[PDB]
């Protein structure tokens, strides 16, 4: 079997970046309440505190993940790099908004 195997469509890889460490732990505890792994799997590639960085874009491009920013900013250089690499930066400011958007991406992965 091919040493490198194809990630299935129903797999959401997410990068979580937050303004403060306590905010990140809150989002990570919400990602630990995921119970629908059968229909779709949620993978946490990397989590950290601070603005979106090139490593986050490189990690998202490596695993075809989605960067979720919580009360953080992404500069034009980082945003332009994401366009070339196809990464989706999803900056939010409210935790119920960032979870609703997280559920919308999971729904898309689900089978029709």
């Amino acid at each position: 079997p091919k040493e490198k195997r194809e990630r299935d469509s129903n797999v959401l890889s997410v990068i979580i970046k937050g303004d403060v460490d306590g905010s990140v732990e809150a989002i990570l505890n919400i990602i630990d309440t995921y119970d629908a792994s059968h229909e779709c799997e949620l993978e946490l590639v990397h989590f950290g505190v601070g603005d979106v960085s090139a490593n986050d874009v490189n990690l998202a491009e490596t695993f075809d993940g989605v960067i979720y920013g919580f009360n953080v900013n992404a500069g034009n250089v980082i945003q332009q790099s994401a366009a070339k690499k196809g990464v989706k930066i999803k900056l939010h400011k409210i935790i119920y908004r960032l979870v609703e958007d997280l559920q919308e991406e999971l729904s898309s992965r689900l089978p029709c």
């Binding site: 490198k4 993978e43 946490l44 990397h46 990690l59 490596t62």
Partner: protein
């Protein structure tokens, strides 16, 4: 060659040395993509634990994991050094045990 030819050719020009898998660097940071085993070339037989990792430069490469037993997984961070695996054709990188997410081998 004649003295006239040696003068005309000049001093011998060394080729620029070939950068190995680390691109002339002692170590590189990498992210583990997948783990697997690769069989050694004849006459050796074994299941040598290897992994594919994207380096900080953006080049995916196969890296050998030394020691008895490892727990590397996808998305993890590892530091890779040079040193080819003699019996694994094409394996020119080695994971450093005890750095980042790759821990030291557990004794016995």
């Amino acid at each position: 060659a004649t003295l006239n030819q040696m003068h005309r050719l000049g001093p011998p020009k060394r080729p620029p040395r070939k950068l190995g898998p680390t691109e002339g660097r002692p170590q590189l940071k990498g992210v583990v993509l997948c783990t697997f085993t690769r069989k050694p070339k004849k006459p050796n037989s074994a299941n040598r634990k290897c992994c594919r990792v994207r380096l900080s430069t953006g080049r995916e490469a196969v890296c050998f994991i030394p020691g008895e037993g490892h727990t590397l997984q996808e998305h993890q961070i590892v530091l890779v050094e040079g040193g080819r695996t003699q019996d694994l054709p094409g394996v020119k990188l080695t994971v450093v045990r005890g750095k980042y997410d790759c821990g030291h081998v557990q004794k016995k």
